[PDB]
Amino acid sequence: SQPPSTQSTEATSGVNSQEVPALTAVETGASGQAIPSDVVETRHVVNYKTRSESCLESFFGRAACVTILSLTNSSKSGEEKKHFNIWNITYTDTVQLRRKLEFFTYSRFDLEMTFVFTENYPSTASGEVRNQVYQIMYIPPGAPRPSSWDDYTWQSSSNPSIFYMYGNAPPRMSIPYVGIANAYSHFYDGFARVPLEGENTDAGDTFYGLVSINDFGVLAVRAVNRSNPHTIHTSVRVYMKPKHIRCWCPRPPRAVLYRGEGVDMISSAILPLAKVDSITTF
Amino acid sequence: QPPSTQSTEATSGVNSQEVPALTAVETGASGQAIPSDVVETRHVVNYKTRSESCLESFFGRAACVTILSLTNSSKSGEEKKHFNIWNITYTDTVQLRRKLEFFTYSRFDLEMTFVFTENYPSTASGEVRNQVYQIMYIPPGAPRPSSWDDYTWQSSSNPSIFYMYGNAPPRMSIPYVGIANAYSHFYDGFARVPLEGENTDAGDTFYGLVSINDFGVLAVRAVNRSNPHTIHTSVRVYMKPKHIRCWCPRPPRAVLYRGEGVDMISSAILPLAKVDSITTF
Amino acid sequence: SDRVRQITLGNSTITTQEAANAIVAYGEWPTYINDSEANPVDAPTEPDVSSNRFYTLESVSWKTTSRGWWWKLPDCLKDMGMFGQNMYYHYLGRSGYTIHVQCNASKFHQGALGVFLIPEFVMACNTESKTSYVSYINANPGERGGEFTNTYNPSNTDASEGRKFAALDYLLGSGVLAGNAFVYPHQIINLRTNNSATIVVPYVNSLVIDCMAKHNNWGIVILPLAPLAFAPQVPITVTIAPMCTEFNGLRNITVPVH
Amino acid sequence: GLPTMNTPGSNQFLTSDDFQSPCALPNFDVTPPIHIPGEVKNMMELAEIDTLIPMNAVDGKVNTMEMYQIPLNDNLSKAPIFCLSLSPASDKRLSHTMLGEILNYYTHWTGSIRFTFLFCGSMMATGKLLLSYSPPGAKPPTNRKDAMLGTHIIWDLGLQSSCSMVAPWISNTVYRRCARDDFTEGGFITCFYQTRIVVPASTPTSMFMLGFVSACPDFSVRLLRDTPHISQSKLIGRT
Amino acid sequence: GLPTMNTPGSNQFLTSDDFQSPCALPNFDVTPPIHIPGEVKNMMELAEIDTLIPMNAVDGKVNTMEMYQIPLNDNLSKAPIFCLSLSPASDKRLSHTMLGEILNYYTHWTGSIRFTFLFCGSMMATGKLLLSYSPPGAKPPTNRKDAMLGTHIIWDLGLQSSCSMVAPWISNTVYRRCARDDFTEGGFITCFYQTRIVVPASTPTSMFMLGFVSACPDFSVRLLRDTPHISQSK
Amino acid sequence: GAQVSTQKTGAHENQNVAANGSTINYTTINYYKDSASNSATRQDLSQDPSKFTEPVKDLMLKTAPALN
Amino acid sequence: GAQVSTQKTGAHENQNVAANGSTINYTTINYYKDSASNSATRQDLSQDPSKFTEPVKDLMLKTAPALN
Amino acid sequence: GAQVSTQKTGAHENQNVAANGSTINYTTINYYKDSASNSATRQDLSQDPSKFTEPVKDLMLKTAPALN
Ligand SMILES: CCCCCCCCCCCCCC(=O)O
Ligand SMILES: CCCCCCCCCCCCCC(=O)O
C-alpha cells in the first residue's frame, strides 16, 4: 500500500477537563508523550511525510572509506618488501564510519566492498611504466600469509581473490555476513581468556576488549607486475557499506575523538562542548 | 492521437453586428481574433503540434553551468589547488539562468553530468599516470575539507563519485530537494528581519534569494599524490532539469547580468538597436 | 496503585511504598532458550530457586561530592549464592536480571539518582601508553563495585592503576556524554517522589548463552544527576536477582585469578 | 554471461540524452507538491500573450519608454505612420517582444500572427486608421493606394478603443526560419490614415497608440537553438 | 552478440550505488538469526527518546556533570532563567544531545519538538514556572510579558514531578536546515518564574531542574550528511 | 513490467495519426528505485493559455463588444 | 522471474498516495545465487518506539497522572 | 527459456527455511551451445557417509554388540 507517514495533526479546541497529558513523570523511565494537540489549540494537518532516510538501511547505505594502503612497485632491492601490503580486516581505521556503526551494540549485515586505485611516480625521475594489475586476496585467520610479494601463497587456491587492471571500472565484491555469533558485536566487555589462580599475578591487560576477541584475518594486496627502472607509488582505498542491515540495543554517540581501536580517551580531547556566556544568553 | 494546433475553418464575406476584430485591450485580455474572423479563409487541416515548446522540451537539454580548476602540483606550493570547492549554483552561466528565469517558480528533478579534460600546462612535459578524480557533495551543515587529503573525503555520508579519466563522463540523478514545495527563482525579501533596536544600515547581503540559497557545495579533488610532472584539469559541470513544472511566468532579462541577482551594469542599460525611421520596414 | 509494589523471586521478597512504576527493558520479559535457538547440545541445568534470589551488594554512600558508582552485573553476583557458584562450575550460562535500587531520604532532602543499565559497559583504560590495557582483576570489582571521578589523569606505565579503568562521570568512563545515557533502559529516583526504582532486563548478547567468567553482558551505572543536598549522606542499596537462568557444560571448578 | 556488442555512439555524452541514471540521493523524501497558481505547461502559452512592440526605435526614442509609443497627429498626410518587416525573431522591433523572445530560442516557426492596436487619445478624438498586411513580394507599400491591394482592416476610432489585424499564414513553406532570410521573408505590415484624426478645440493634436503582438492559436515552433541576445565574459575556473 | 550502447555514468563508482555484485564467498552459510532484544528499525525511534539538555553552558560548568543541572532559587526574580535558540543541530546546547547528534547526520528536518522538565528540589518546596516558546522574527523574550504572549504552559510543581512543553512545528518552510541558517530561525525557548518558589523553613533554598529534549511523532529528517563532530589525523 | 508506447513520427512514417503500423511502438523499463532516475516523462500536451491571455472574471465572447 | 515495486515519487509525480499511474514502477531481477549479492531491501517503515520510550510494565496512559 | 531458483539465505532473511516469498529468487538463462559453458550446478546436499564409515556386509545397529 502507501508508505506509512508520520503523525498527522487532529484539530482540537480548548480543554478545561481534568485529563492532563501536559503533566507527567520521567522518573518512571518513560519519555514524555505530549504532542501539539495536547498542549495547544490546533488545526487539522495532513501529514504525508515519510521517515525513509532514517531507516537503518538508508542510514548505513553509503560506502565509506575504510582504509588507505600504500604499495610501491620498485626495482631497488631494499624496497622490494614494499611491493605488497597486508592489512588487518577492520573498520576502526576511519572515524566517520565507526561513529555510526558504534551506535548499536549489535548488528547483522552483508558487506559490499569496493576499491579505488590511483598511482604516481614518487621519485625524481619518471619514465615508461606499464599498466599494473593488482591482486587483492583475503587470507582468513589461520590461513598462511605471504612473506613476500612473490610468495607461493598468491596461488590462492582457496583464498578468494581479485585481479584488477588499473583503469578499468573500480573492482567490487559482495561478502555475506561472516559472524560466528548470531550478530556482530561492536563492543566486548570482557576478556579473551580468564586468568586463573596462580599463573600471571594480574593478567588481562594484554587481552581485554573486542580488539582481542574478533580476528577477521587480513586482506593482502600486492602489485602483480614485476619491477621497473622507474617506480610507482600506488594507493589503494578500500570502501565499505553494510547492506541488508539490522541493529539492536542503541547507544549514545561518541563525544570524544577515538583513541584508536579501543574506547580509550586522549587527555588532550575530553572536552566536547563549547561554552556559552550564560544560561540566559541565547 | 496527440492534440494538434487548431485547424482553420473555411469562411466567406461577413456583414453583421459582430465585432471579433474590435476589442478593449484595457481589460487585460489579449485580442482573440484569428484569420477566420478577419479574412476569407479556406479549410485547412492542422496536424502540426506544439510538443517542441512544451516545458519539458524547452528545458530538455544539459547546459554547462560552471568550470572548476584542479591542479596536481609537484611544487612545494599549490597543494591547495588539488581540490576545488564550489557553491552549487547555475548563476555562473547566462544562457541557462536566462531560460530558468522565465518563471518565478519551478519544480524539477535535476541530473548532473561532468566532463573532465586535462593538459600538461608546463614546459617540462613528461610522464603522468592516468589520474582519478573524486566528486564529493558536501550538504549544507556538513564540514568542508581543508585539503585534498583531509579526512572528510572519507565520505561516510556525503555521497561521491569516483571517476577514472577516460571512462564515460560520470553522471548522477538528484531529486527535487527544496524545503519549499517549489524552487524560487526570485525572492523579494530578506533572510532575516532587522528589528527596531538594530542599526539602520540594514542591507549587508540580507536582500535577495541569494541569502536564502544554501544547497551545499561541490568539492572536487584529484585523488592522488603529487607527480613530478604536473597537470591542469578543467572540470565542466553540466545540468539538465528533468520532470519540470513551472509557475507564474515572467519576461526574460534583456541586459547582461551583474552577479548573482538582478543587479545592472551601467554599460548595458540600452539593449535595443536603433532604426532610421518608424516607417522603415 | 503503581507506586506500591511487591516483587518476589525464589525465597526473597522485596516491597516498597514509593516505586517509580517498573521498567522491562525493550518490553521483553526475560526467558529461557527455546529449542529453535539452542546452541549447545548438552542438556541444561535450571537451578531455579537455588540461584533466583535477591541478593544485596554492599551499600554505598551518597555524598555531595560523589560522582557515581558502577558494577558489572554477572560479576557482582559471582561472590554469592548458588548463582555465584554455578558460574564456576559451568562453562556457559545465561541470566536475565531484576535490579532494585533504593535510596532512603526525607522529604527535606533533594537531589536525584539516574539508574542506567548498560549492555556492554566497556570502559576506557586509564593510561596513554597502551590501548584497552586493563587487567582482569581491576575490570571485575565483584560485590564491591567501582566508582567515577571527574578528572582524567592517565598513568605513566603501570605506576598506579595503569591497568585500571578511567572513569570520567560526565563521559561515563567511555567518551560518550552522560546526558544521552537515557537511551539505555533507565529510571530516576528523585528524592521528591520515589525511594526506589526497578528495572528488569533480558539476557542480552550476540549469543544465546556465553561464558560468564569472560563476558559481562550488562553493567549498572548510578549517577547523581541532581546533587545531593539537605537543610548530608544517604546510603544507596542495590539488590539484584538473576532470573530465568540456565547453565551448560559442567567443567572443572574454575578459580579466577585473585 | 550474455554476449553483447557495443554500437557506435557508445560512451559519449549527448546533451539531448534521455537515458536513465542512478540516484545520488536514494530514498529521498521529496517535499510534496502543492497547488501553485499560474502553472505553465507550454512556452507557447506565453507566446500567445499580447505584449508591446518597441516600434519607435529611432534615435532619441530608442531604449526609453517613448519607444513603445506610436505617434499620431491630426495633420493631413498620406504618408504611412509606420512600417514593419514581418520577421518576428529578426526585426529589431519584433525580436524583443515576448513573442520574439520566445522565438529567439527557435530556429523555425509557423502560423498566423496577431497585431493589436490600442488608441490612447482623448475621448473627444476621432478618425480612422488603415492597417494592412501583404505577402513578401512585389514592393513594400509606400502609399495607401498600394496598401489597399492586400489584406486590410479599417478601424473606426470609438468606444471600442482597440482593434486587431491578423497576418494570415501565407507562405510557400510550412515553416519559416527565425534567422533573417530573404528566401523566407515574411511580408510587410503598414499603417496609413484612412481619415485624419479629428481634434476638437481643447483636445491635444498629437496622440499615441500602443501596438501589440502575439501568437495566434495555430502558431507553432519546430526546433530549439541558443539565443544571440545574452552573453558574458569567458568563464574562468575558481583557483 | 546483442547490440548495446554504454551511457554516461558508465564505469564510475558512486558511494550511493545500489547494484548487485558477485559474492566473494559462494554458498556461504550465514549464521541463523535469533530474536535479539531491543531491535531498532529506524533512527527516528532514537530521536523520540528523551535525553538531557546540557543547558548550564556557563564557563566552569562546561564539560562536567553539572552541565546538565539548571539552578533555581527561591529568591524573587523576574529575570529569564533559560535561553535556547532551538536549532537542534546547530545550537551549542542541543547539538550534542542525542536528538541533535542524529540531526547532525541530516541536512534538513521537520516536526514539533518536545521539552520535558523534572524538578529535583525538596519535596517540601512548591511553586509555578512559565515554560514558553516564541516563534522567530521577533524581539527575544526579554521579560515574562513577552513569554506570556507566545505559546506557553504553566508548570505547577507537585506530585507529578515532570511536565512537557511542546514547541509546535510552526515554520514557513516545510523543512528547516539543520545548518545554522539565519533564514530558518528557530525562535526562542525561555522560562520565567510564574511565582517565586515557595520554600518552607529548614529546607534547601537552592535546587536544580533537569531538562530533556526529544522528537515528537510528526518529526522526520531528510538527506543524510557527514557530521562535523568527529575528526581525525590524516 | 515494461511500459509500451508510441514513438514520435519521422520521415518514412504515416499520416501522423499513429494508427498505421505497430512499428511505431517502443518499450522501456525503469531500472532505479527513485522515480527521479527515470527518463523524462511522456509529454503532456494539454494547454490552457486562457489563464494568461484572458483571465477575466466576467467572460466576454470574442464577437461581443468588449465594452457595452 | 522479475519482481516489481512502487518507485519513490519525484518532482512531476503524483501525490503521496503513489497509487496514481502504473508508470511508477521499478523492475528487478536478481542475477546471483547468494542473496548477499542482491541490492538493498525495500524501505521498512515499521516502527515501534515503545521499546525505548515507554517500556513500562504497568499500563501507563498519557492522560492519567504518571504517578498513581 | 529461463529457470528460476531460490537463493541461498543472506543476512536479512528471517526465514532460514527459505520461506519468505518471491523475495528470494534468482533467474538464470544458459547462453551457450555446450553445457560445459553453463555456470556451476545446483547444490545437492544428498550424502551417504556409510559408504566410507560403515561399509559392512552385515548390517550393524548402533547398540548391537559389534560381535556376538
Ligand atoms: C575476498 C574478500 C573477503 C574478505 C572477508 C573479510 C570479512 C569482512 C567483514 C569485516 C567486518 C566484520 C566486523 C563487523 O561487520 O562488525
Ligand atoms: C549530490 C549533489 C546534490 C546537489 C544538491 C543541489 C541540487 C540543485 C538545487 C537547486 C538549485 C537552485 C534553484 C533556484 O535558484 O531556485
Q: What are the angstrom distances between the C-alpha of C156 and each of B54, C161, D219, H7?
A: 75, 9, 88, 56
Number of CB atoms found within 10 A of residue D75's CB: 12
**Cα B89 to middle of ligand 2, angstroms:** 7
Among candidates B147, B144, B129, B131, which has minimal Cα distance to B83? B147
**Taking CB atoms and an 8 Å limit, are B179 and E137 in contact across chains?**
no
| Alpha-carbon span E188 to E170, nearest angstrom | 12
Among candidates E176, G66, G50, which has minimal Cα distance to B212? E176
Helix (H, G, I), strand (E, B) or coil at D99: helix
Q: What are the angstrom distances between the C-alpha of A86 and each of A68, A97, A104, A161, A218?
A: 11, 21, 29, 14, 6
Helix (H, G, I), strand (E, B) or coil at A254: strand
DSSP for C174-223 reads TTB-GGGGGGSSEEEEETTT-SEEEEEE---SSSSSB-TTTB--EEEEEE
CATH number of C5-250: 2.60.120.20
Q: Ligand 1: which residues within 6 Å by Cβ?
A: A 89, 91, 111, 138, 160, 173, 175, 178, 184, 216; E 24
Among candidates C169, C122, A269, C183, which has minimal Cα distance to E67? C169
* Atom 9 of ligand 2, nearest CA residue: B215
Residue D176 phi/psi, 5-degree rounding, is -100, 155
| Alpha-carbon span C91 to F11, nearest angstrom | 84
Number of CB atoms found within 10 A of residue D193's CB: 21
The count of domains in chain G is 1
Q: For the purposes of burial, counting CB atoms within 10 Å of the CB of B180, is it exposed (0-12), middle (13-18) or buried (19 or more)? A: middle
Q: Which ligand sits closest to the CA of B65? A: 2
End-to-end distance of chain E based on CA atoms, in angstroms?
48
Which of F27, F33, F44, F46 to mutate against chain G (most G CBs within 10 Å)? F33
Residue with cell 540516484: D23
- Name chain G contacts of C183, Cβ cutoff 8 Å: 52
**Chain D contact present for A50, CB below 8 A:** yes
Whether ligand 2 lies within 6 angstroms of the CB of B103 is answered as no
- Which atom of ligand 2 lies nearest, measured to the CA of B184? 16
**Chain G contact present for F28, CB below 8 A:** no
The residues that bridge with C60 in the sheet, in sequence order, are: C236
The chains found to touch D (3+ Cβ pairs under 8 angstroms) are A, B, E, F, G, H
The chains found to touch E (3+ Cβ pairs under 8 angstroms) are A, B, C, D, G, H
**Taking CB atoms and an 8 Å limit, are D2 and H31 in contact across chains?**
yes
Q: Which of residues 149-168 of E touch A (CB under 8 A)?
A: 151, 153, 155, 160-166, 168
Among candidates C126, C9, C148, which has minimal Cα distance to C71? C148
Q: Which of B2, B28, B176 is the closest to F56 by Cβ? A: B28
Q: Do residues B251 and B114 lie in contact, with contact meaning Cβ atoms separated by under 8 Å?
A: no
Q: Do residues A111 and A184 lie in contact, with contact meaning Cβ atoms separated by under 8 Å?
A: no
**Chain H contact present for D5, CB below 8 A:** no
**Taking CB atoms and an 8 Å limit, are A275 and E216 in contact across chains?**
no
Q: Closest residue of E to H17, CA-based?
A: E32
**Cα A89 to middle of ligand 1, angstroms:** 6
Helix (H, G, I), strand (E, B) or coil at F37: helix
| Alpha-carbon span F39 to G26, nearest angstrom | 12
Q: How far apart are the CA of A55 and the nearest CA of chain D, in angstroms?
A: 10
Q: To what resolution in angstroms was this structure determined?
A: 4.1
CB-based contacts of F45, cutoff 8 Å, min separation 6:
B2, B3, B49, B50, B51, B54, D42
Q: Do residues C205 and C95 lie in contact, with contact meaning Cβ atoms separated by under 8 Å?
A: no
Number of CB atoms found within 10 A of residue F12's CB: 6
The residues that bridge with C9 in the sheet, in sequence order, are: C12
DSSP for B39-67 reads S-----------GGGBHHHHT-S-EEEEE
**Chain G contact present for A16, CB below 8 A:** no
Q: Which of residues 152-211 of B touch G (CB under 8 A)?
A: 175-176
CB-based contacts of A176, cutoff 8 Å, min separation 6:
A110, E23, E25, E28, E30, G34, G36, H10, H11
Q: What are the angstrom distances between the C-alpha of A133 and each of A136, A163, B29, D228, E198?
A: 10, 6, 72, 51, 80
Residue with cell 514558553: E132
- Which atom of ligand 2 lies nearest, measured to the CA of D25? 1
For chain A, give every domain's residue range. Answer: 1-282
Residue G18 backbone class (left: φ over 0; alpha: ψ -120 to 50; beta: rest) = left
Q: Do residues A44 and E206 lie in contact, with contact meaning Cβ atoms separated by under 8 Å?
A: no
Query: Sign of dihedral through CA atoms F33, F36, F40, F46?
Result: positive
- Name chain A contacts of B175, Cβ cutoff 8 Å: none
* Atom 4 of ligand 1, nearest CA residue: A138
Query: Sign of dihedral through CA atoms A271, A272, A276, A280?
Result: negative
Q: Do residues A261 and A71 lie in contact, with contact meaning Cβ atoms separated by under 8 Å?
A: no
**Taking CB atoms and an 8 Å limit, are A202 and C137 in contact across chains?**
yes
Tally DSSP H helices, then E strands, for chain F: 1, 2
Residue E121 carries which DSSP code?
S
**Cα E186 to middle of ligand 2, angstroms:** 23
**Cα E47 to middle of ligand 2, angstroms:** 28
- B vs E, Cβ pairs < 8 A, gives 116
Q: Do residues C256 and C136 lie in contact, with contact meaning Cβ atoms separated by under 8 Å?
A: yes
Whether ligand 2 lies within 6 angstroms of the CB of B220 is answered as no
Query: Sign of dihedral through CA atoms B151, B155, B156, B161?
Result: negative
Q: How far apart are the CA of B48 and the nearest CA of chain F, in angstroms?
A: 9
| Alpha-carbon span E66 to E60, nearest angstrom | 9
- Name chain A contacts of H12, Cβ cutoff 8 Å: 110, 244-246
From A101, A111, A184, mutation site for ligand 1 pocket: most ligand atoms within 8 A of C-beta: A111
**Cα G40 to middle of ligand 1, angstroms:** 18
Q: Do residues C249 and C93 lie in contact, with contact meaning Cβ atoms separated by under 8 Å?
A: no
- Name chain A contacts of G40, Cβ cutoff 8 Å: 57, 61, 243-244
Whether ligand 2 lies within 6 angstroms of the CB of D24 is answered as yes
Strand C69-72 vs strand C146-147: parallel, antiparallel, or unpaired? antiparallel
Cell numbers standing for residue E58: 556557563
Q: Closest residue of C to G64, CA-based?
A: C2
**Chain E contact present for A31, CB below 8 A:** yes
Q: Which of F37, F52, F67 is the closest to D45 by Cβ? A: F52
User: Is chain B adjacent to chain G, meaning 3+ CB pairs within 8 angstroms?
Assistant: yes
**Taking CB atoms and an 8 Å limit, are D19 and E4 in contact across chains?**
no
Domain that residue G43 falls in: 1-68
**Cα C145 to middle of ligand 1, angstroms:** 37
Q: Which of residues 19-78 of E touch H (CB under 8 A)?
A: 26-30, 32-33
Whether ligand 2 lies within 6 angstroms of the CB of D23 is answered as no
Residue E86 backbone class (left: φ over 0; alpha: ψ -120 to 50; beta: rest) = left
From B68, B215, B242, B244, mutation site for ligand 2 pocket: most ligand atoms within 8 A of C-beta: B215
- Name chain A contacts of C135, Cβ cutoff 8 Å: 202-205, 208
Among candidates A62, A52, A121, which has minimal Cα distance to A97? A62
Cell numbers standing for residue B155: 565520505
The residues that bridge with H8 in the sheet, in sequence order, are: G34
| Alpha-carbon span B257 to C131, nearest angstrom | 60
**Chain G contact present for A33, CB below 8 A:** yes
Residue with cell 478601424: D155
